Amino acid sequence: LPEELVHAGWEKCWSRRENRPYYFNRFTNQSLWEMPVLGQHDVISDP
């Protein structure tokens, strides 16, 4: 998890119920199981 993910609030942790590590967005309380993504892709914006 590079500063890119840590910026959004993502944080790797060990879920006891799942008995393994994963990802938890402390910002949206999200709970994934594999490194998430970010705006690293293209920028589809026309402000």
Side-chain angles (χ1 to χ4, degrees):
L1 289 185
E3 228 182 35
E4 275 291 15
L5 295 179
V6 166
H7 262 187
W10 287 103
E11 47 151 62
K12 191 179 201 250
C13 297
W14 173 271
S15 211
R16 295 214 288 259
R17 242 143 240 71
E18 246 301 10
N19 184 276
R20 53 101 118 255
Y22 63 112
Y23 301 82
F24 170 90
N25 205 226
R26 68 194 205 162
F27 216 60
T28 60
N29 186 357
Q30 237 165 343
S31 21
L32 301 190
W33 299 115
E34 240 221 40
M35 247 235 229
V37 195
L38 224 120
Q40 256 258 27
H41 235 100
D42 302 73
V43 286
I44 65 123
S45 89
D46 181 16

Coordinates of all heavy atoms in Angstrom, one line a residue:
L1 N 0.9 -1.2 0.0 CA 0.0 0.0 0.0 C 0.9 1.3 0.0 O 1.3 1.7 1.0 CB -0.8 -0.1 1.3 CG -1.8 -1.2 1.2 CD1 -2.7 -1.2 2.4 CD2 -2.7 -1.0 -0.1
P2 N 1.1 1.8 -1.2 CA 1.9 3.0 -1.3 C 1.1 4.2 -0.8 O 0.0 4.2 -0.5 CB 2.1 3.1 -2.8 CG 1.0 2.4 -3.4 CD 0.5 1.3 -2.5
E3 N 1.8 5.3 -0.6 CA 1.2 6.6 -0.1 C -0.1 6.8 -0.9 O -1.1 7.5 -0.4 CB 2.2 7.7 -0.3 CG 2.3 8.5 0.9 CD 3.3 9.7 0.7 OE1 3.3 10.2 -0.4 OE2 4.0 10.0 1.6
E4 N -0.2 6.4 -2.1 CA -1.5 6.6 -2.9 C -2.7 6.0 -2.2 O -3.7 6.7 -2.0 CB -1.2 5.8 -4.2 CG -0.4 6.7 -5.2 CD -1.3 7.9 -5.7 OE1 -2.3 8.1 -5.0 OE2 -0.9 8.6 -6.6
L5 N -2.6 4.8 -1.8 CA -3.8 4.2 -1.1 C -3.9 4.7 0.3 O -4.9 5.1 0.8 CB -3.4 2.7 -1.0 CG -3.4 2.1 -2.5 CD1 -3.1 0.6 -2.4 CD2 -4.8 2.3 -3.1
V6 N -2.8 4.8 1.0 CA -2.8 5.4 2.4 C -3.5 6.8 2.4 O -4.0 7.2 3.3 CB -1.4 5.4 2.8 CG1 -1.3 6.3 4.1 CG2 -0.9 4.0 3.2
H7 N -3.4 7.5 1.3 CA -3.9 8.8 1.2 C -5.5 8.7 1.3 O -6.1 9.5 2.0 CB -3.5 9.3 -0.2 CG -2.3 10.2 -0.1 ND1 -1.8 10.9 -1.2 CD2 -1.5 10.5 1.0 CE1 -0.8 11.6 -0.7 NE2 -0.5 11.4 0.6
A8 N -6.1 7.9 0.5 CA -7.6 7.7 0.6 C -8.0 7.2 2.0 O -9.1 7.5 2.5 CB -7.9 6.7 -0.4
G9 N -7.1 6.5 2.7 CA -7.5 6.0 4.0 C -7.4 4.5 4.1 O -7.6 3.8 5.1
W10 N -7.0 3.9 3.0 CA -6.8 2.4 3.0 C -5.8 1.9 4.0 O -4.8 2.6 4.2 CB -6.4 2.0 1.5 CG -7.6 2.2 0.6 CD1 -7.8 3.2 -0.2 CD2 -8.8 1.3 0.5 NE1 -9.0 3.1 -0.9 CE2 -9.6 1.9 -0.5 CE3 -9.1 0.1 1.0 CZ2 -10.8 1.3 -0.9 CZ3 -10.3 -0.5 0.7 CH2 -11.2 0.1 -0.3
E11 N -6.0 0.8 4.6 CA -4.9 0.3 5.6 C -5.0 -1.2 5.7 O -6.1 -1.8 5.9 CB -5.3 0.9 6.9 CG -6.8 0.8 7.1 CD -7.1 0.7 8.6 OE1 -6.8 1.7 9.3 OE2 -7.6 -0.3 9.1
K12 N -3.9 -1.9 5.5 CA -3.9 -3.4 5.5 C -4.1 -3.8 7.0 O -3.5 -3.3 7.9 CB -2.6 -3.8 5.0 CG -2.6 -5.3 4.7 CD -1.3 -5.8 4.1 CE -1.5 -7.1 3.4 NZ -0.7 -8.1 4.3
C13 N -4.9 -4.9 7.2 CA -5.0 -5.4 8.6 C -5.3 -6.9 8.6 O -5.5 -7.5 7.6 CB -6.2 -4.6 9.2 SG -5.8 -2.8 9.2
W14 N -5.4 -7.5 9.8 CA -5.7 -8.9 9.8 C -7.1 -9.2 10.4 O -7.4 -9.1 11.6 CB -4.7 -9.5 10.8 CG -5.0 -10.9 11.1 CD1 -5.8 -11.4 12.1 CD2 -4.5 -12.1 10.4 NE1 -5.9 -12.8 12.0 CE2 -5.1 -13.3 11.0 CE3 -3.7 -12.3 9.3 CZ2 -4.8 -14.5 10.5 CZ3 -3.4 -13.6 8.8 CH2 -4.0 -14.7 9.4
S15 N -8.1 -9.5 9.5 CA -9.5 -9.7 10.0 C -9.5 -11.1 10.7 O -9.2 -12.1 10.2 CB -10.3 -9.7 8.7 OG -11.6 -9.2 9.0
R16 N -10.0 -11.1 11.9 CA -10.1 -12.4 12.7 C -11.2 -13.3 12.1 O -11.0 -14.4 11.9 CB -10.5 -11.9 14.1 CG -9.3 -11.1 14.7 CD -9.3 -11.4 16.2 NE -10.4 -10.8 16.8 CZ -10.3 -9.6 17.4 NH1 -9.3 -9.4 18.3 NH2 -11.1 -8.6 17.2
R17 N -12.4 -12.7 11.8 CA -13.5 -13.5 11.2 C -13.0 -14.2 10.0 O -13.2 -15.4 9.8 CB -14.6 -12.5 10.9 CG -15.8 -12.9 11.7 CD -16.5 -11.6 12.2 NE -16.5 -11.6 13.6 CZ -15.4 -11.5 14.3 NH1 -15.0 -10.3 14.6 NH2 -14.7 -12.5 14.7
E18 N -12.3 -13.5 9.1 CA -11.8 -14.2 7.8 C -10.5 -14.9 8.1 O -10.1 -15.7 7.3 CB -11.6 -13.0 6.9 CG -12.6 -13.1 5.7 CD -12.4 -14.4 5.0 OE1 -11.7 -15.2 5.5 OE2 -13.0 -14.5 3.9
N19 N -9.9 -14.7 9.2 CA -8.6 -15.4 9.6 C -7.6 -15.1 8.5 O -6.9 -16.0 8.0 CB -9.0 -16.9 9.6 CG -7.8 -17.7 10.0 OD1 -6.9 -18.0 9.1 ND2 -7.6 -18.1 11.2
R20 N -7.4 -13.8 8.2 CA -6.4 -13.4 7.2 C -6.3 -11.9 7.1 O -7.1 -11.2 7.7 CB -6.8 -14.1 5.9 CG -8.3 -13.6 5.6 CD -8.3 -12.5 4.6 NE -9.1 -13.1 3.4 CZ -8.4 -13.4 2.4 NH1 -7.6 -12.6 1.8 NH2 -8.6 -14.6 1.9
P21 N -5.3 -11.5 6.3 CA -5.2 -10.0 6.1 C -6.0 -9.5 5.0 O -6.6 -10.3 4.2 CB -3.7 -9.9 5.8 CG -3.3 -11.2 5.2 CD -4.4 -12.2 5.6
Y22 N -6.2 -8.2 4.9 CA -7.0 -7.6 3.8 C -6.8 -6.1 3.7 O -5.8 -5.6 4.1 CB -8.4 -8.0 4.2 CG -8.8 -7.3 5.5 CD1 -9.8 -6.3 5.5 CD2 -8.2 -7.7 6.7 CE1 -10.1 -5.7 6.7 CE2 -8.5 -7.1 7.9 CZ -9.4 -6.1 7.9 OH -9.8 -5.5 9.1
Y23 N -7.8 -5.4 3.4 CA -7.7 -3.9 3.3 C -8.9 -3.3 4.0 O -10.1 -3.7 3.9 CB -7.7 -3.5 1.8 CG -6.5 -4.2 1.2 CD1 -6.6 -5.6 0.8 CD2 -5.3 -3.5 1.0 CE1 -5.5 -6.2 0.2 CE2 -4.2 -4.2 0.4 CZ -4.3 -5.5 0.0 OH -3.2 -6.2 -0.5
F24 N -8.7 -2.2 4.7 CA -9.9 -1.5 5.4 C -9.8 0.0 5.2 O -8.9 0.7 5.6 CB -9.7 -1.9 6.9 CG -10.7 -1.0 7.7 CD1 -12.0 -1.5 7.9 CD2 -10.3 0.2 8.2 CE1 -12.9 -0.8 8.7 CE2 -11.2 1.0 8.9 CZ -12.5 0.5 9.2
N25 N -10.8 0.6 4.5 CA -10.8 2.0 4.3 C -11.2 2.8 5.5 O -12.4 2.8 5.8 CB -11.7 2.3 3.1 CG -11.4 3.5 2.4 OD1 -12.2 4.4 2.1 ND2 -10.1 3.8 2.1
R26 N -10.3 3.3 6.3 CA -10.7 4.0 7.5 C -11.6 5.3 7.1 O -12.2 5.9 8.0 CB -9.4 4.4 8.2 CG -8.7 5.5 7.3 CD -7.3 5.6 7.8 NE -6.9 7.0 7.4 CZ -5.8 7.6 7.9 NH1 -6.0 8.2 9.1 NH2 -4.7 7.5 7.3
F27 N -11.6 5.6 5.9 CA -12.4 6.8 5.4 C -13.8 6.4 5.2 O -14.7 7.0 5.7 CB -11.7 7.2 4.1 CG -11.7 8.7 4.0 CD1 -11.1 9.5 5.0 CD2 -12.4 9.4 3.0 CE1 -11.1 10.9 4.9 CE2 -12.4 10.8 2.9 CZ -11.8 11.5 3.9
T28 N -14.1 5.4 4.4 CA -15.5 5.0 4.1 C -15.8 3.7 4.9 O -16.7 3.0 4.6 CB -15.5 4.7 2.6 OG1 -14.6 3.7 2.2 CG2 -15.2 6.0 1.9
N29 N -15.0 3.3 5.8 CA -15.2 2.1 6.6 C -15.3 0.9 5.7 O -15.8 -0.2 6.0 CB -16.6 2.3 7.3 CG -16.9 1.2 8.2 OD1 -16.1 0.2 8.3 ND2 -17.9 1.2 9.0
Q30 N -14.8 1.0 4.5 CA -14.9 -0.1 3.5 C -14.0 -1.3 4.0 O -13.1 -1.1 4.8 CB -14.3 0.4 2.2 CG -15.3 0.2 1.1 CD -14.9 1.1 -0.1 OE1 -14.1 2.0 0.0 NE2 -15.5 0.9 -1.3
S31 N -14.3 -2.5 3.5 CA -13.5 -3.6 3.9 C -13.2 -4.6 2.7 O -14.1 -5.4 2.4 CB -14.3 -4.3 5.0 OG -15.7 -3.9 4.9
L32 N -12.1 -4.5 2.1 CA -11.9 -5.3 0.9 C -11.0 -6.5 1.2 O -10.8 -6.8 2.4 CB -11.1 -4.4 -0.1 CG -12.0 -3.2 -0.4 CD1 -11.3 -2.4 -1.6 CD2 -13.4 -3.6 -0.8
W33 N -10.5 -7.2 0.3 CA -9.6 -8.4 0.5 C -8.4 -8.4 -0.4 O -7.6 -9.3 -0.4 CB -10.5 -9.6 0.2 CG -11.7 -9.6 1.1 CD1 -13.0 -9.4 0.7 CD2 -11.8 -9.7 2.6 NE1 -13.8 -9.4 1.8 CE2 -13.1 -9.6 3.0 CE3 -10.8 -9.9 3.5 CZ2 -13.4 -9.7 4.3 CZ3 -11.1 -10.0 4.9 CH2 -12.4 -9.9 5.3
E34 N -8.3 -7.3 -1.2 CA -7.2 -7.2 -2.1 C -6.8 -5.7 -2.4 O -7.7 -4.9 -2.4 CB -7.6 -7.9 -3.4 CG -6.7 -9.1 -3.7 CD -6.4 -9.1 -5.2 OE1 -6.2 -8.0 -5.8 OE2 -6.4 -10.2 -5.8
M35 N -5.6 -5.4 -2.5 CA -5.2 -4.0 -2.8 C -6.2 -3.3 -3.7 O -6.5 -3.8 -4.8 CB -3.8 -4.0 -3.4 CG -2.8 -3.4 -2.4 SD -1.9 -2.1 -3.3 CE -0.2 -2.6 -2.8
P36 N -6.8 -2.2 -3.2 CA -7.8 -1.4 -4.0 C -7.1 -0.6 -5.1 O -5.9 -0.8 -5.4 CB -8.4 -0.5 -3.0 CG -7.4 -0.3 -1.9 CD -6.5 -1.5 -2.0
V37 N -7.8 0.3 -5.7 CA -7.2 1.1 -6.8 C -7.4 2.6 -6.5 O -7.9 3.0 -5.5 CB -7.9 0.8 -8.1 CG1 -7.2 1.3 -9.3 CG2 -8.1 -0.8 -8.2
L38 N -6.9 3.5 -7.4 CA -7.0 4.9 -7.1 C -7.2 5.7 -8.4 O -7.5 5.1 -9.4 CB -5.8 5.3 -6.4 CG -6.1 6.3 -5.2 CD1 -5.7 5.6 -3.9 CD2 -5.4 7.6 -5.4
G39 N -6.9 7.0 -8.4 CA -7.0 7.8 -9.6 C -5.8 7.5 -10.5 O -5.7 8.1 -11.6
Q40 N -4.9 6.7 -10.1 CA -3.7 6.4 -10.9 C -4.0 6.2 -12.3 O -3.2 6.5 -13.2 CB -3.1 5.1 -10.3 CG -1.9 5.4 -9.4 CD -0.6 5.1 -10.2 OE1 -0.6 5.2 -11.4 NE2 0.5 4.8 -9.5
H41 N -5.2 5.8 -12.6 CA -5.7 5.6 -14.0 C -5.7 7.0 -14.8 O -5.0 7.9 -14.4 CB -7.1 5.0 -14.0 CG -7.1 3.7 -14.7 ND1 -7.0 2.5 -14.1 CD2 -7.2 3.5 -16.1 CE1 -7.1 1.6 -15.1 NE2 -7.2 2.1 -16.3
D42 N -6.5 7.1 -15.8 CA -6.6 8.4 -16.6 C -7.4 9.4 -15.8 O -8.0 9.1 -14.8 CB -7.2 8.0 -17.9 CG -6.4 6.9 -18.6 OD1 -6.4 5.8 -18.1 OD2 -5.7 7.3 -19.6
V43 N -7.5 10.6 -16.3 CA -8.3 11.6 -15.6 C -9.5 12.0 -16.4 O -9.4 13.0 -17.3 CB -7.4 12.8 -15.4 CG1 -6.4 12.5 -14.3 CG2 -6.6 13.1 -16.7
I44 N -10.6 11.4 -16.3 CA -11.8 11.7 -17.1 C -12.5 12.9 -16.5 O -13.6 12.8 -16.0 CB -12.7 10.5 -17.1 CG1 -13.2 10.2 -15.7 CG2 -11.9 9.3 -17.6 CD1 -14.7 10.2 -15.6
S45 N -12.0 14.1 -16.5 CA -12.6 15.3 -15.9 C -12.5 16.5 -16.9 O -11.5 16.7 -17.5 CB -11.9 15.6 -14.6 OG -10.8 16.4 -14.9
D46 N -13.5 17.3 -16.9 CA -13.5 18.5 -17.8 C -14.1 19.7 -17.1 O -15.0 20.3 -17.6 CB -14.4 18.1 -19.0 CG -14.4 19.2 -20.0 OD1 -13.6 20.1 -19.9 OD2 -15.3 19.2 -20.9
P47 N -13.5 20.0 -16.0 CA -13.9 21.2 -15.2 C -13.5 22.5 -15.9 O -13.4 22.5 -17.1 CB -13.2 21.0 -13.9 CG -12.0 20.2 -14.2 CD -12.3 19.3 -15.4

